[PDB]
Design a protein around this ligand. Structure first.
Ligand code: CL
Length: 243
């Protein structure tokens, strides 16, 4: 399969252990340099924002139009020093906004909801605004792709409109009638560090291919690489051709 060879060559560039998983609703396929990562659990990092948003909307702790106001105290990034909706905060990965959401949900409800939907190992520990950044919550790349595949198809155990609104929070770009939805993550606070790019490509006719890049990161790594590599792979696969 020369297409597989083309994809694997993309990983020849890269010293970090990496896996790229796809799911089309029938079959799981794995690419990369360490395929066992696909069935290994890692902290979700900011990919957890998907589940956080679903849980927050489902349980009336926020709406998709509610503005989370900045209080005026400088945040870690100047990019975060503004008001955000949950969708805007999704694309900017505004951690303090989603920490506020998590505290609205609270530890009892967060724990019962993660158990209800079977998200990863469903463990949150005692800090409701830290568990996706520090652990103990972990999830495998295969679990991630099945989760977002179900989101794409509206088959998660949430209200239809809750799922649809969080789905569009993830929208990145379209090419022709093909749509890319995705969320990055970089679990820096744990060792080894984990890098994620999770999402799906939707065609006009409704067909969906979900994907997850999962790779080892280290201090000083290029922040843009997760998305770039994922787009390069999706193009080589013909799932999301470059225009
Ligand atoms: Cl990120």
């Amino acid at each position: 399969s020369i297409i597989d060879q083309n994809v694997q060559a993309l990983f020849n560039e890269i010293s970090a252990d990496a896996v790229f998983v796809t799911y089309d609703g029938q079959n799981i396929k794995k690419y990369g340099t360490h395929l066992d990562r696909a069935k290994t659990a890692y902290i979700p990092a900011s990919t957890f924002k998907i589940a956080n948003a679903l849980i927050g909307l489902e349980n009336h702790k926020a709406t998709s139009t509610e503005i989370f106001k900045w209080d005026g105290k400088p945040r870690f990034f100047k990019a975060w020093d503004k008001d955000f909706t949950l969708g805007e905060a999704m694309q900017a990965s505004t951690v303090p906004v989603y920490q506020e959401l998590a505290r609205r949900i609270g530890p009892s409800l967060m724990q019962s909801e993660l158990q209800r939907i079977g998200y990863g190992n469903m463990q949150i520990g005692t800090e409701v605004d830290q568990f996706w950044l520090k652990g103990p919550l972990t999830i495998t790349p295969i679990q991630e792709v099945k989760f977002v595949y179900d989101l794409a198809q509206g088959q998660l155990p949430f209200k239809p409109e809750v799922q649809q609104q969080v789905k569009e929070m993830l929208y990145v770009e379209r090419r022709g009638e093909n749509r890319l939805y995705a969320k990055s993550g970089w679990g820096m606070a744990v060792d080894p560090q984990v890098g994620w790019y999770v999402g799906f490509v939707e065609k006009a006719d409704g067909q969906v291919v979900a994907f997850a890049l999962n790779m080892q990161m280290k201090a000083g790594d290029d922040i843009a690489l997760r998305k770039q590599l994922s787009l390069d792979v999706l193009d080589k696969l013909g799932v999301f051709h470059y225009l």
